[PDB]
Amino acid sequence: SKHKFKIHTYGSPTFCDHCGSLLYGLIHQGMKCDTCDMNVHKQCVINVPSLCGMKRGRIYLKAEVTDEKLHVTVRDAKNLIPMDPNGLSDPYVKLKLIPDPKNESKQKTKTIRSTLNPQWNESFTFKLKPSDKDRRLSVEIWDWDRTTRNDFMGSLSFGVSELMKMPASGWYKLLNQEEGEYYNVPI
Ligand SMILES: [Pb+2]
Ligand SMILES: [Pb+2]
Ligand SMILES: [Pb+2]
Ligand SMILES: [Pb+2]
Ligand SMILES: [Zn+2]
Ligand SMILES: [Zn+2]
C-alpha cells in the first residue's frame, strides 16, 4: 500500500515518523501523507515502506549478572531500517543503565558500515552499584552519520533486578525509542 507524500508546514513541534528526529525549518519542514497522516523528513521519504494504512528488525543479545557485574554480549542484528539515501544504514549499539541524567554509563559497539544486517560480536561489562537494582539496561541501535546527527533505529531494555533473577539470551524485537526504555519483546 503506497503512501502519497506532499510538502507540509507544521505549526507545532513534529517528529519524523521514520527516523525519529525533529522536523525543523521555518516552513515546509517535512512531507505528510495525504492518506494516513504520516510525517517524514524529505530525505526520509525514500526509505519509508509501502505500508500506508497498515518493523525495525531484531537483535541477538545475552545479558547475565555475576556477583556485582552485568555482562552483555552484542552479537548481531537483522532486517534493520535504512536511514540513508542509498537505502542502507551504518549501525552501532549504545548500551547504558537508565535513568542516566548525567550520561555516565554509556558504552558502544563499533560501527558497521553500509548494512541492514550487521555483526558486531562485542561484549561489555557494567560494575553495578546498589541503586542499579532500580535501573534498566538500555540497548539502542543508531545509524552513524558522519556530518549530521545520528539516527535512531530501534531499541529495547531489561530490568536490572529481573536480569539478576534470570539471564537473557536470544533474539529481541526492536522497538521505538520511548517503548524501548521500558520494555522488551523476546522472539
Ligand atoms: Pb534521517
Ligand atoms: Pb542518516
Ligand atoms: Pb548513515
Ligand atoms: Pb541524521
Ligand atoms: Zn500513507
Ligand atoms: Zn527522518
PDB file of all heavy atoms in Angstrom, residues 115-141, unseen atoms left out:
ATOM      1  N   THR A 115      25.043  -1.461   5.896  1.00  0.00           N
ATOM      2  CA  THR A 115      24.370  -2.743   6.046  1.00  0.00           C
ATOM      3  C   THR A 115      23.065  -2.578   6.800  1.00  0.00           C
ATOM      4  O   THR A 115      22.910  -1.653   7.595  1.00  0.00           O
ATOM      5  CB  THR A 115      25.257  -3.761   6.772  1.00  0.00           C
ATOM      6  OG1 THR A 115      24.585  -5.020   6.801  1.00  0.00           O
ATOM      7  CG2 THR A 115      25.545  -3.341   8.214  1.00  0.00           C
ATOM      8  N   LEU A 116      22.125  -3.485   6.555  1.00  0.00           N
ATOM      9  CA  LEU A 116      20.947  -3.616   7.402  1.00  0.00           C
ATOM     10  C   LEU A 116      21.008  -4.885   8.236  1.00  0.00           C
ATOM     11  O   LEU A 116      20.028  -5.223   8.918  1.00  0.00           O
ATOM     12  CB  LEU A 116      19.665  -3.571   6.573  1.00  0.00           C
ATOM     13  CG  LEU A 116      19.520  -2.342   5.686  1.00  0.00           C
ATOM     14  CD1 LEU A 116      18.260  -2.423   4.822  1.00  0.00           C
ATOM     15  CD2 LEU A 116      19.487  -1.087   6.542  1.00  0.00           C
ATOM     16  N   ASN A 117      22.140  -5.593   8.189  1.00  0.00           N
ATOM     17  CA  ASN A 117      22.289  -6.887   8.860  1.00  0.00           C
ATOM     18  C   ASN A 117      23.681  -6.977   9.476  1.00  0.00           C
ATOM     19  O   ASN A 117      24.497  -7.824   9.106  1.00  0.00           O
ATOM     20  CB  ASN A 117      22.001  -8.022   7.880  1.00  0.00           C
ATOM     21  CG  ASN A 117      20.564  -8.008   7.425  1.00  0.00           C
ATOM     22  OD1 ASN A 117      19.690  -8.565   8.091  1.00  0.00           O
ATOM     23  ND2 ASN A 117      20.297  -7.330   6.313  1.00  0.00           N
ATOM     24  N   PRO A 118      23.977  -6.100  10.425  1.00  0.00           N
ATOM     25  CA  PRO A 118      25.328  -6.008  10.986  1.00  0.00           C
ATOM     26  C   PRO A 118      25.667  -7.135  11.952  1.00  0.00           C
ATOM     27  O   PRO A 118      24.818  -7.639  12.696  1.00  0.00           O
ATOM     28  CB  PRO A 118      25.269  -4.686  11.764  1.00  0.00           C
ATOM     29  CG  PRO A 118      23.827  -4.632  12.224  1.00  0.00           C
ATOM     30  CD  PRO A 118      23.055  -5.127  11.031  1.00  0.00           C
ATOM     31  N   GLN A 119      26.958  -7.463  11.999  1.00  0.00           N
ATOM     32  CA  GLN A 119      27.505  -8.358  13.011  1.00  0.00           C
ATOM     33  C   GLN A 119      28.575  -7.597  13.776  1.00  0.00           C
ATOM     34  O   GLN A 119      29.519  -7.089  13.168  1.00  0.00           O
ATOM     35  CB  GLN A 119      28.090  -9.623  12.368  1.00  0.00           C
ATOM     36  CG  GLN A 119      27.107 -10.427  11.506  1.00  0.00           C
ATOM     37  CD  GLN A 119      27.813 -11.520  10.681  1.00  0.00           C
ATOM     38  OE1 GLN A 119      29.028 -11.495  10.521  1.00  0.00           O
ATOM     39  NE2 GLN A 119      27.056 -12.478  10.184  1.00  0.00           N
ATOM     40  N   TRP A 120      28.421  -7.489  15.094  1.00  0.00           N
ATOM     41  CA  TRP A 120      29.403  -6.809  15.936  1.00  0.00           C
ATOM     42  C   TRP A 120      30.270  -7.775  16.731  1.00  0.00           C
ATOM     43  O   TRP A 120      31.486  -7.582  16.817  1.00  0.00           O
ATOM     44  CB  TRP A 120      28.719  -5.873  16.927  1.00  0.00           C
ATOM     45  CG  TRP A 120      27.920  -4.780  16.299  1.00  0.00           C
ATOM     46  CD1 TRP A 120      28.402  -3.610  15.771  1.00  0.00           C
ATOM     47  CD2 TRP A 120      26.494  -4.733  16.153  1.00  0.00           C
ATOM     48  NE1 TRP A 120      27.361  -2.847  15.301  1.00  0.00           N
ATOM     49  CE2 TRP A 120      26.180  -3.514  15.527  1.00  0.00           C
ATOM     50  CE3 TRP A 120      25.454  -5.600  16.503  1.00  0.00           C
ATOM     51  CZ2 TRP A 120      24.870  -3.146  15.243  1.00  0.00           C
ATOM     52  CZ3 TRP A 120      24.157  -5.238  16.215  1.00  0.00           C
ATOM     53  CH2 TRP A 120      23.876  -4.016  15.605  1.00  0.00           C
ATOM     54  N   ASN A 121      29.665  -8.770  17.385  1.00  0.00           N
ATOM     55  CA  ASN A 121      30.409  -9.736  18.191  1.00  0.00           C
ATOM     56  C   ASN A 121      31.280  -9.052  19.242  1.00  0.00           C
ATOM     57  O   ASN A 121      32.482  -9.309  19.349  1.00  0.00           O
ATOM     58  CB  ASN A 121      31.208 -10.668  17.299  1.00  0.00           C
ATOM     59  CG  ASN A 121      30.322 -11.588  16.537  1.00  0.00           C
ATOM     60  OD1 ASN A 121      29.516 -12.299  17.139  1.00  0.00           O
ATOM     61  ND2 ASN A 121      30.401 -11.537  15.212  1.00  0.00           N
ATOM     62  N   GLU A 122      30.657  -8.182  20.033  1.00  0.00           N
ATOM     63  CA  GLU A 122      31.345  -7.428  21.073  1.00  0.00           C
ATOM     64  C   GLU A 122      30.660  -7.659  22.413  1.00  0.00           C
ATOM     65  O   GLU A 122      29.484  -8.005  22.470  1.00  0.00           O
ATOM     66  CB  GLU A 122      31.356  -5.935  20.757  1.00  0.00           C
ATOM     67  CG  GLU A 122      32.274  -5.559  19.609  1.00  0.00           C
ATOM     68  CD  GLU A 122      32.265  -4.071  19.369  1.00  0.00           C
ATOM     69  OE1 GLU A 122      32.569  -3.338  20.330  1.00  0.00           O
ATOM     70  OE2 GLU A 122      31.939  -3.650  18.247  1.00  0.00           O
ATOM     71  N   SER A 123      31.399  -7.450  23.501  1.00  0.00           N
ATOM     72  CA  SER A 123      30.817  -7.639  24.819  1.00  0.00           C
ATOM     73  C   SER A 123      31.222  -6.497  25.730  1.00  0.00           C
ATOM     74  O   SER A 123      32.220  -5.814  25.494  1.00  0.00           O
ATOM     75  CB  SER A 123      31.204  -8.974  25.446  1.00  0.00           C
ATOM     76  OG  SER A 123      32.577  -9.028  25.735  1.00  0.00           O
ATOM     77  N   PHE A 124      30.437  -6.316  26.794  1.00  0.00           N
ATOM     78  CA  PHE A 124      30.512  -5.144  27.657  1.00  0.00           C
ATOM     79  C   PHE A 124      30.236  -5.570  29.084  1.00  0.00           C
ATOM     80  O   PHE A 124      29.381  -6.426  29.327  1.00  0.00           O
ATOM     81  CB  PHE A 124      29.469  -4.094  27.219  1.00  0.00           C
ATOM     82  CG  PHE A 124      29.638  -3.692  25.797  1.00  0.00           C
ATOM     83  CD1 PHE A 124      29.060  -4.432  24.769  1.00  0.00           C
ATOM     84  CD2 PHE A 124      30.467  -2.636  25.469  1.00  0.00           C
ATOM     85  CE1 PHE A 124      29.275  -4.104  23.456  1.00  0.00           C
ATOM     86  CE2 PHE A 124      30.692  -2.301  24.163  1.00  0.00           C
ATOM     87  CZ  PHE A 124      30.096  -3.032  23.145  1.00  0.00           C
ATOM     88  N   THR A 125      30.950  -4.970  30.030  1.00  0.00           N
ATOM     89  CA  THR A 125      30.715  -5.232  31.445  1.00  0.00           C
ATOM     90  C   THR A 125      30.389  -3.929  32.160  1.00  0.00           C
ATOM     91  O   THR A 125      31.062  -2.913  31.947  1.00  0.00           O
ATOM     92  CB  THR A 125      31.941  -5.900  32.074  1.00  0.00           C
ATOM     93  OG1 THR A 125      32.183  -7.128  31.381  1.00  0.00           O
ATOM     94  CG2 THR A 125      31.711  -6.214  33.544  1.00  0.00           C
ATOM     95  N   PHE A 126      29.347  -3.961  32.989  1.00  0.00           N
ATOM     96  CA  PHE A 126      28.973  -2.857  33.862  1.00  0.00           C
ATOM     97  C   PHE A 126      29.167  -3.291  35.306  1.00  0.00           C
ATOM     98  O   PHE A 126      28.640  -4.329  35.721  1.00  0.00           O
ATOM     99  CB  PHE A 126      27.503  -2.474  33.664  1.00  0.00           C
ATOM    100  CG  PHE A 126      27.180  -1.967  32.283  1.00  0.00           C
ATOM    101  CD1 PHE A 126      26.923  -2.854  31.246  1.00  0.00           C
ATOM    102  CD2 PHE A 126      27.111  -0.597  32.023  1.00  0.00           C
ATOM    103  CE1 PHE A 126      26.613  -2.388  29.966  1.00  0.00           C
ATOM    104  CE2 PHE A 126      26.801  -0.126  30.747  1.00  0.00           C
ATOM    105  CZ  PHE A 126      26.563  -1.022  29.727  1.00  0.00           C
ATOM    106  N   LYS A 127      29.905  -2.495  36.073  1.00  0.00           N
ATOM    107  CA  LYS A 127      30.048  -2.744  37.501  1.00  0.00           C
ATOM    108  C   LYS A 127      28.841  -2.126  38.197  1.00  0.00           C
ATOM    109  O   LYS A 127      28.667  -0.905  38.177  1.00  0.00           O
ATOM    110  CB  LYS A 127      31.360  -2.144  37.999  1.00  0.00           C
ATOM    111  N   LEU A 128      27.993  -2.953  38.801  1.00  0.00           N
ATOM    112  CA  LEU A 128      26.733  -2.462  39.349  1.00  0.00           C
ATOM    113  C   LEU A 128      26.922  -1.872  40.741  1.00  0.00           C
ATOM    114  O   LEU A 128      27.712  -2.375  41.546  1.00  0.00           O
ATOM    115  CB  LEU A 128      25.720  -3.595  39.433  1.00  0.00           C
ATOM    116  CG  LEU A 128      25.365  -4.302  38.125  1.00  0.00           C
ATOM    117  CD1 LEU A 128      24.418  -5.441  38.406  1.00  0.00           C
ATOM    118  CD2 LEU A 128      24.746  -3.327  37.133  1.00  0.00           C
ATOM    119  N   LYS A 129      26.197  -0.790  41.011  1.00  0.00           N
ATOM    120  CA  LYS A 129      26.043  -0.185  42.324  1.00  0.00           C
ATOM    121  C   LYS A 129      24.705  -0.594  42.908  1.00  0.00           C
ATOM    122  O   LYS A 129      23.811  -1.035  42.182  1.00  0.00           O
ATOM    123  CB  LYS A 129      26.099   1.342  42.206  1.00  0.00           C
ATOM    124  N   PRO A 130      24.537  -0.490  44.225  1.00  0.00           N
ATOM    125  CA  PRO A 130      23.259  -0.909  44.821  1.00  0.00           C
ATOM    126  C   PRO A 130      22.044  -0.246  44.199  1.00  0.00           C
ATOM    127  O   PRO A 130      21.016  -0.907  44.021  1.00  0.00           O
ATOM    128  CB  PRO A 130      23.434  -0.547  46.301  1.00  0.00           C
ATOM    129  CG  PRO A 130      24.902  -0.647  46.518  1.00  0.00           C
ATOM    130  CD  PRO A 130      25.553  -0.190  45.247  1.00  0.00           C
ATOM    131  N   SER A 131      22.140   1.033  43.837  1.00  0.00           N
ATOM    132  CA  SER A 131      21.000   1.721  43.253  1.00  0.00           C
ATOM    133  C   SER A 131      20.659   1.197  41.862  1.00  0.00           C
ATOM    134  O   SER A 131      19.535   1.403  41.398  1.00  0.00           O
ATOM    135  CB  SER A 131      21.286   3.216  43.178  1.00  0.00           C
ATOM    136  OG  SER A 131      22.446   3.465  42.404  1.00  0.00           O
ATOM    137  N   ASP A 132      21.589   0.520  41.186  1.00  0.00           N
ATOM    138  CA  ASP A 132      21.283  -0.016  39.865  1.00  0.00           C
ATOM    139  C   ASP A 132      20.185  -1.072  39.889  1.00  0.00           C
ATOM    140  O   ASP A 132      19.655  -1.405  38.823  1.00  0.00           O
ATOM    141  CB  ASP A 132      22.548  -0.587  39.220  1.00  0.00           C
ATOM    142  CG  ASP A 132      23.535   0.492  38.793  1.00  0.00           C
ATOM    143  OD1 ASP A 132      23.093   1.599  38.393  1.00  0.00           O
ATOM    144  OD2 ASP A 132      24.754   0.238  38.841  1.00  0.00           O
ATOM    145  N   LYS A 133      19.828  -1.605  41.063  1.00  0.00           N
ATOM    146  CA  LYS A 133      18.736  -2.571  41.136  1.00  0.00           C
ATOM    147  C   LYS A 133      17.413  -1.980  40.672  1.00  0.00           C
ATOM    148  O   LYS A 133      16.503  -2.734  40.307  1.00  0.00           O
ATOM    149  CB  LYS A 133      18.610  -3.131  42.558  1.00  0.00           C
ATOM    150  N   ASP A 134      17.292  -0.654  40.663  1.00  0.00           N
ATOM    151  CA  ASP A 134      16.090   0.024  40.211  1.00  0.00           C
ATOM    152  C   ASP A 134      16.216   0.539  38.789  1.00  0.00           C
ATOM    153  O   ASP A 134      15.299   1.214  38.312  1.00  0.00           O
ATOM    154  CB  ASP A 134      15.738   1.185  41.144  1.00  0.00           C
ATOM    155  N   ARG A 135      17.328   0.255  38.113  1.00  0.00           N
ATOM    156  CA  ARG A 135      17.588   0.747  36.767  1.00  0.00           C
ATOM    157  C   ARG A 135      17.306  -0.329  35.726  1.00  0.00           C
ATOM    158  O   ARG A 135      16.981  -1.475  36.047  1.00  0.00           O
ATOM    159  CB  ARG A 135      19.022   1.282  36.660  1.00  0.00           C
ATOM    160  CG  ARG A 135      19.226   2.566  37.457  1.00  0.00           C
ATOM    161  CD  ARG A 135      20.482   3.344  37.040  1.00  0.00           C
ATOM    162  NE  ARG A 135      20.547   4.578  37.814  1.00  0.00           N
ATOM    163  CZ  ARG A 135      21.071   4.685  39.036  1.00  0.00           C
ATOM    164  NH1 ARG A 135      21.644   3.642  39.638  1.00  0.00           N
ATOM    165  NH2 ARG A 135      21.034   5.856  39.655  1.00  0.00           N
ATOM    166  N   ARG A 136      17.391   0.077  34.463  1.00  0.00           N
ATOM    167  CA  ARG A 136      17.198  -0.812  33.326  1.00  0.00           C
ATOM    168  C   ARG A 136      18.423  -0.752  32.427  1.00  0.00           C
ATOM    169  O   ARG A 136      19.017   0.318  32.242  1.00  0.00           O
ATOM    170  CB  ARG A 136      15.954  -0.405  32.533  1.00  0.00           C
ATOM    171  CG  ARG A 136      14.687  -0.466  33.366  1.00  0.00           C
ATOM    172  CD  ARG A 136      13.427  -0.183  32.544  1.00  0.00           C
ATOM    173  NE  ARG A 136      13.212  -1.152  31.468  1.00  0.00           N
ATOM    174  CZ  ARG A 136      12.729  -2.383  31.641  1.00  0.00           C
ATOM    175  NH1 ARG A 136      12.384  -2.818  32.857  1.00  0.00           N
ATOM    176  NH2 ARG A 136      12.625  -3.196  30.597  1.00  0.00           N
ATOM    177  N   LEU A 137      18.799  -1.908  31.871  1.00  0.00           N
ATOM    178  CA  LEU A 137      19.787  -1.957  30.803  1.00  0.00           C
ATOM    179  C   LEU A 137      19.099  -1.542  29.512  1.00  0.00           C
ATOM    180  O   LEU A 137      18.158  -2.206  29.074  1.00  0.00           O
ATOM    181  CB  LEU A 137      20.331  -3.377  30.670  1.00  0.00           C
ATOM    182  CG  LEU A 137      21.219  -3.590  29.437  1.00  0.00           C
ATOM    183  CD1 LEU A 137      22.513  -2.750  29.493  1.00  0.00           C
ATOM    184  CD2 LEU A 137      21.503  -5.069  29.279  1.00  0.00           C
ATOM    185  N   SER A 138      19.535  -0.420  28.942  1.00  0.00           N
ATOM    186  CA  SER A 138      19.031   0.104  27.680  1.00  0.00           C
ATOM    187  C   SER A 138      19.969  -0.304  26.546  1.00  0.00           C
ATOM    188  O   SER A 138      21.189  -0.125  26.646  1.00  0.00           O
ATOM    189  CB  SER A 138      18.977   1.632  27.791  1.00  0.00           C
ATOM    190  OG  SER A 138      18.782   2.225  26.532  1.00  0.00           O
ATOM    191  N   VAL A 139      19.389  -0.817  25.461  1.00  0.00           N
ATOM    192  CA  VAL A 139      20.123  -1.242  24.278  1.00  0.00           C
ATOM    193  C   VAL A 139      19.496  -0.525  23.087  1.00  0.00           C
ATOM    194  O   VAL A 139      18.334  -0.785  22.751  1.00  0.00           O
ATOM    195  CB  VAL A 139      20.047  -2.764  24.103  1.00  0.00           C
ATOM    196  CG1 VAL A 139      20.830  -3.197  22.869  1.00  0.00           C
ATOM    197  CG2 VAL A 139      20.526  -3.473  25.376  1.00  0.00           C
ATOM    198  N   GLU A 140      20.243   0.390  22.465  1.00  0.00           N
ATOM    199  CA  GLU A 140      19.725   1.189  21.356  1.00  0.00           C
ATOM    200  C   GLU A 140      20.618   1.047  20.137  1.00  0.00           C
ATOM    201  O   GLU A 140      21.841   1.192  20.244  1.00  0.00           O
ATOM    202  CB  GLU A 140      19.660   2.671  21.715  1.00  0.00           C
ATOM    203  CG  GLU A 140      18.677   2.973  22.839  1.00  0.00           C
ATOM    204  CD  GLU A 140      18.418   4.450  23.070  1.00  0.00           C
ATOM    205  OE1 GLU A 140      19.248   5.280  22.656  1.00  0.00           O
ATOM    206  OE2 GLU A 140      17.375   4.781  23.678  1.00  0.00           O
ATOM    207  N   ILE A 141      20.020   0.804  18.974  1.00  0.00           N
ATOM    208  CA  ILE A 141      20.755   0.813  17.713  1.00  0.00           C
ATOM    209  C   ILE A 141      20.556   2.170  17.059  1.00  0.00           C
ATOM    210  O   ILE A 141      19.416   2.647  16.936  1.00  0.00           O
ATOM    211  CB  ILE A 141      20.275  -0.304  16.770  1.00  0.00           C
ATOM    212  CG1 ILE A 141      20.328  -1.664  17.463  1.00  0.00           C
ATOM    213  CG2 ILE A 141      21.106  -0.279  15.475  1.00  0.00           C
ATOM    214  CD1 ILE A 141      19.964  -2.805  16.543  1.00  0.00           C
TER     215      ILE A 141
END
